[PDB]
């Protein structure tokens, strides 16, 4: 069985640095050099720098002389990664090596320059392609029109189509479609119809993408009944129904006002044949979440992972959450939370916070606690790559409820986790102080006040009163005097009723001198 040579040379390059003692091992491992071996190494290279290093070393070491297909392969990957000067400098060096120039190397260079938006240099190469002495017939003009109308050069593309049709060139459906898309994009209706009657006079029957061109042009001209007239015209012309055409029919319906009509054409989607494509499910959701219809959202959200499909943009998963929660159906949001964590997506703090905020606002407190615990046991807050953070309203009422009507411990655990990312809200701290005071552990209120003192959070006067009386109720007047000293050093004078309470509690416990030290500051 054993191992091939392309994969082991790629494991050389992937694991070790490119040194001369690695090159010696590669040279002694290769038993006979051929372009088949070079091509199988070059395709299977894990990184472009490994590929470029191998292609340079094999031609500079005298082991082989490279051919047209290897040169084409190098330019294709260098231009897909957009190492523009790299590919240009390789391309210019070929007639000295002896292999001829072909237009195949030039057209991928056109596409490579235009992918980065340096399309003026693509046109510059195109004008000198005939100067250099290579045939410039069909596919070169096709790629030039593909790249200049992506930037939107309709007034140029007219002139270069004139220079196309002047030099004995017969344009076809690909040319006409690639120019009609750009002319519809650049808002040129008369130019689109002129170049449609041009392909009428040339005499070639339009196809599915050609009829897609006019309907997406009418979608971007916001005329949808006319697009429906075109959509029955394509049925009356006997061409097969395309899933892309149905997708842009849904898009043109939901572009302005008709949001129920997307479901109405999904009822006819059975006739086309291929219902579950990604783009329909990607675009259909935000229109109906903008409208506010829910039963036609939850069923297709059930059908999302029924055939394992994902949207193009994933913020619709948040927009449907906020729309469905504001609609009011709570029991099916537990399908959304498990739709998040099962496709590929890690769940986020804001995603859990919206649902905890709804269960908190509508009398579902134990369910809010359940979502709270599965949020905090999964350490979602402390994740660096997650972007959406927990809203202030996702913890501001639930800290109040937890401290006032029950346990304070997991409330302080959640909020101490929130300090470690972004929160220093005083409201939850004050509520944690009162909750820890009235639970029966005033040491926690005192330490949270120490946290406030070191973090610089502004400290109130009424917070220390509950701490003092909590110390009072459990029989620790020395701790009460310590808290009183901290209150005075913070800068709040208490009232003589509290002074009279603490002085008598200190005196009756035999602590005369602490009471006298209270007397000193009340004299002062």
């Amino acid at each position: 069985n054993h191992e091939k040579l392309e994969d082991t040379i790629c494991r050389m390059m992937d694991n070790r640095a490119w040194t001369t003692r690695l090159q010696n091992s590669i040279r002694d491992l290769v038993p006979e050099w051929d372009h088949s071996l070079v091509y199988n190494v070059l395709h299977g290279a894990k990184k472009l720098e490994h590929a470029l290093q191998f292609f340079r070393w094999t031609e500079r070491s005298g082991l082989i002389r490279h051919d047209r297909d290897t040169h084409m392969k190098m330019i294709k990957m260098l231009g897909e990664v957009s190492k523009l000067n790299h590919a240009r400098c390789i391309l210019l060096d070929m007639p000295e090596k002896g292999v001829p120039w072909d237009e195949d190397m030039f057209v991928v260079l056109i596409e490579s320059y235009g992918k980065a938006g340096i399309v003026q240099e693509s046109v510059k190469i195109f004008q000198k392609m005939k100067d250099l002495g290579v045939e410039r017939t069909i596919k070169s003009y096709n790629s030039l029109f593909k790249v200049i109308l992506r930037r939107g050069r309709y007034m140029m593309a007219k002139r270069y189509f004139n220079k196309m049709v002047s030099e004995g060139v017969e344009p076809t459906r690909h040319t006409y479609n690639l120019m009609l898309w750009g002319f519809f994009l650049s808002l040129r209706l008369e130019t689109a119809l002129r170049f449609f009657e041009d392909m009428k006079t040339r005499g070639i029957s339009p196809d599915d993408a050609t009829f897609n061109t006019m309907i997406n042009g009418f979608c971007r001209f916001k005329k949808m009944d006319e697009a429906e007239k075109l959509f029955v015209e394509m049925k009356g012309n006997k061409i097969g129904p395309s899933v892309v055409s149905y997708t842009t029919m849904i898009k043109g319906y939901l572009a302005v006002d008709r949001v129920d009509d997307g479901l109405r054409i999904f009822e006819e989607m059975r006739s086309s044949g291929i219902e579950p494509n990604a783009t329909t499910y990607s675009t259909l959701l935000p229109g109906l979440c903008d409208a506010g219809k829910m039963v036609e959202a939850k069923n297709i959200l059930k059908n999302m992972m029924a055939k394992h499909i994902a949207p193009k943009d994933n913020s619709i998963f948040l927009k449907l959450l906020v729309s469905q929660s504001k609609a009011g159906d709570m029991a099916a949001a537990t399908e959304v939370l498990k739709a998040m964590a099962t496709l590929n997506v890690p769940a986020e703090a804001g995603h859990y916070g919206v649902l905890i905020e709804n269960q908190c606002k509508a009398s579902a407190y134990n369910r809010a606690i359940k979502l709270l615990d599965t949020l905090i046991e999964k350490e979602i807050i402390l994740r660096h790559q997650d972007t959406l953070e927990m809203e202030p309203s996702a913890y501001n009422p639930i800290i109040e409820y937890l401290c006032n009507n029950g346990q304070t411990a997991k409330a302080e655990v959640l909020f101490r986790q929130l300090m470690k990312r972004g929160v220093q809200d005083q409201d939850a701290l004050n509520n944690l102080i009162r909750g820890h005071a009235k639970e029966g552990n005033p040491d926690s209120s005192y330490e949270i006040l120490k946290i406030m003192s070191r973090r610089g959070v502004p400290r109130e006067s009424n917070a220390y009163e509950l701490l003092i009386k909590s110390y009072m109720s459990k029989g620790e007047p020395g701790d009460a005097k310590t808290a009183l000293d901290s209150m005075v050093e913070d800068g709040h004078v208490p009232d003589s009723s509290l002074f009279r309470s603490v002085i008598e509690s200190l005196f009756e416990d035999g602590r005369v001198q602490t009471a006298s030290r209270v007397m000193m500051i009340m004299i002062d």
């Binding site: 003692r21 010696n24 040279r27 002694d28």
Partner: protein, 66 residues
């Protein structure tokens, strides 16, 4: 201390050619190196000796075997 060298011909007590052997540094530096009877055991010269001996002894084996 001893050195590694690669024989280019047949030396009577050292061995046959194409073989790495261990010699004294004063032997190699003053006798075998200027007379091209041995080369240092580094990678460039080992590769050179191996390939040139392969090309010539291909003819030699083609003559001797048949």
């Amino acid at each position: 201390r001893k050195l590694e060298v690669i024989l280019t011909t047949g030396i009577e007590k050292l061995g046959k050619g194409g073989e790495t052997v261990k010699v004294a540094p004063g032997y190699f530096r003053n006798h075998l190196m200027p007379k091209l009877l041995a080369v240092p055991n580094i990678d460039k010269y080992a590769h050179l000796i191996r390939e040139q001996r392969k090309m010539r002894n291909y003819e030699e084996v083609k003559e001797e075997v048949k």
